[PDB]
């Protein structure tokens, strides 16, 4: 019930057309912080278990919203307001890599339950067929943690703080791949990776912004030599 | 010896100061050999 532990806090804090765009997305800036993120006339959330309805909602709210958020144009950003407009005007045939802890887990969970084939092709309908069966699963209270019972005896797994919201990420993967296919140009291959292996067989470093930050300073031979070697640690010395 | 602004000479006459300056004055080359490479160059 905490204000800091609330997931709507980064959206509530940030919220000419910016004031209008926030209000239409239910985040009224004029309203106080307490009722800004508090859902009006709601007390209980009940799971209906429908993947196709989840996909359409993720599409209408997150992926392709009719009234999107400002999405400002900085020195690093291109300028696109939403995902749907990116693959519509700027689609490329260049290979794609889908990263993210919750994103990778969405594909792995379907693979381990035999619903998704061992060969990771990246076909939207093959991914949607496997997720439709998994997300329509029953929940029963057990002696050693709650279990996710798959329909027509496909399998079972323990329910945790990272497994219940996994189906929303599965809908995000389906919706995002649907926009990639709809565009003029389609990528060479669609792959899911946690880390890229080097020439030795083992990865040198993990995926993220980490290596990019090093390189963008390191690659500039003259500037790196002046700050890291000419000045060095000897700079901050009295 | 030539006296400086304080009244006392900074260094004695000869080739000594000239050898220092002819390496020192070249800002880029001096920074590459004396600071970029430095003493850390001859290290196994």
């Amino acid at each position: 019930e905490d204000v800091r532990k609330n997931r709507l806090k980064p959206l509530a804090t940030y919220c000419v057309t910016n004031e209008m765009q926030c209000r239409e997305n239910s985040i009224d800036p004029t309203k106080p912080l307490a009722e800004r993120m508090k859902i009006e006339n709601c007390s209980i959330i009940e799971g209906t278990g429908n993947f196709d309805k989840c996909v359409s909602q993720v599409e209408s709210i997150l992926v392709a919203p009719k009234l999107p958020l400002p999405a400002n144009i900085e020195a690093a950003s291109s300028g696109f307001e939403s995902v749907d407009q990116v693959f519509r005007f700027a689609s490329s045939t260049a290979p794609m890599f889908i990263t993210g802890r919750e994103m990778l887990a969405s594909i792995d969970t379907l693979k381990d339950h035999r619903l998704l084939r061992s060969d990771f092709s990246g076909d939207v309908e093959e991914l949607a067929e496997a997720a439709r069966e998994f997300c329509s699963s029953e929940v029963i209270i057990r002696t050693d943690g709650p279990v996710i019972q798959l329909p027509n005896a496909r399998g079972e797994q323990k329910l945790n703080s990272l497994n219940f919201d996994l189906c929303k990420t599965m809908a995000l993967t389906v919706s995002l791949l649907r926009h990639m296919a709809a565009g003029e140009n389609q990528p060479s291959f669609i792959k899911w990776e946690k880390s890229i292996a080097g020439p030795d067989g083992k990865p040198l470093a993990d995926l993220g912004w980490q290596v990019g930050v090093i390189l963008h300073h390191v690659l500039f031979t003259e500037e790196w030599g002046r700050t890291a070697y000419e000045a060095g640690y000897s700079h901050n010395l009295e | 010896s030539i006296a400086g602004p304080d009244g006392k000479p900074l260094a004695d006459l000869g080739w000594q100061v000239g050898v220092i300056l002819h390496h020192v004055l070249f800002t880029e080359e001096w920074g590459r050999t004396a600071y970029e490479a430095g003493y850390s160059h001859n290290l196994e």
Binding site: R4, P10, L11, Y14, L33, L62, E74, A76, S77, S78, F80, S82, V83, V86, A90, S92, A94, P95, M96, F97, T99, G100, M103, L172, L176, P187, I196, P203, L204, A205, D206, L207, G208, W209, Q210, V211, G212, V213, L215, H216, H217, V218, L219, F220, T221, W224, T227, A228, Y229, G232, Y233, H235, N236 | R32, T33, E36, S40, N42, L43, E44
Partner: protein
């Protein structure tokens, strides 16, 4: 006999000078450590890296890009967002979130923000040294300490700007803590406003693109076709990024991000015009 003794003795003396003359002219390789502090909305953790430096005469010192390898990623400590939030609860009152509080009045509690940042920095220094002492051997430590360790503390998308002065001043204090480390360990940690700086979602996506192409051996000096680079779709905790045909007619409202012009890649590396987009609304939280 006497001829075999004389010819070998001369050869040993000749090869001795040849080896000595080579040491002066040839390039020397030295091991260097690189520290990157991953400061986020959830946690602030250290990342220790290793690289090979090439010391050539009249050319200077440069890091081999392919030699960059991560050794160990540190433990998850309290985020920078919480550090300032606790500073606002104690020195401005819990009402700060809704009730308007003057920023000028909080300028008197600056050394109190320094003490709060000191508490986190000492733990990050302790964790880094623990990795360096356990992962490096004795000969490696001689090269690592003598050169100096550059630190790159970056606060990613998720940490709020606060719209005042709090976050900007905290970074000035953080840099001072890094530039003044414990002399006990011997590891010369240092930084500057260029390395230690707050980063945005769009910037994070661009660095993630440079990382992916470097590890896949795609990003290099020799061009294959504009270099053949692979795109990335990273859906993180706070923000999601999409960074990725040829000479396409693009609208005026949207600009194609050139990594060379934006000072992210040098002129010697092939030109890369990419579509860089970041959305906070698609991030996990």
């Amino acid at each position: 006999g006497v001829d075999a003794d004389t010819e070998k003795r001369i050869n040993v003396g000749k090869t001795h000078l040849q080896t000595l003359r080579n040491l002066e002219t040839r390039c020397h390789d030295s091991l260097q450590a690189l520290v990157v502090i991953d400061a986020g909305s959830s946690s602030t953790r250290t990342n220790v890296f290793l690289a090979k430096t090439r010391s050539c005469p009249n050319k200077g010192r440069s890091i081999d890009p392919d030699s960059i390898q991560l050794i160990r990623e540190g433990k998850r400590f309290t985020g920078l967002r919480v550090v300032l939030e606790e500073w606002l609860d104690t020195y401005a009152g819990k009402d700060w979130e809704s009730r308007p509080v003057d920023a000028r009045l909080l300028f008197q509690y600056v050394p109190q923000m320094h003490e709060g940042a000191k508490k986190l920095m000492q733990l990050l220094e302790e964790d880094t040294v623990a990795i360096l002492d356990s992962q490096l051997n004795e000969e490696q430590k001689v090269q690592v300490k003598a050169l100096g360790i550059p630190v790159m503390l970056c606060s990613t998308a998720g940490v709020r700007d606060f719209h005042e002065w709090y976050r900007d001043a905290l970074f000035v204090l953080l840099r001072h803590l890094i530039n003044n480390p414990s002399p006990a360990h011997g590891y010369k940690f240092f930084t500057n406003p260029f390395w230690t700086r707050p980063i945005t979602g769009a910037e994070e996506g661009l660095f993630a693109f440079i990382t992916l192409n470097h590890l896949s051996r795609r990003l290099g000096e020799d061009p294959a076709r504009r270099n053949d680079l692979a795109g990335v779709v990273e859906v993180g905790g706070a923000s999601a990024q999409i960074v990725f045909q040829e000479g396409t007619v693009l609208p005026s409202s949207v600009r194609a991000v050139n990594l060379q012009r934006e000072r992210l890649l040098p002129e010697r590396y092939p030109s890369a015009d990419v579509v860089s987009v970041s959305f906070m609304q698609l991030g996990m939280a």
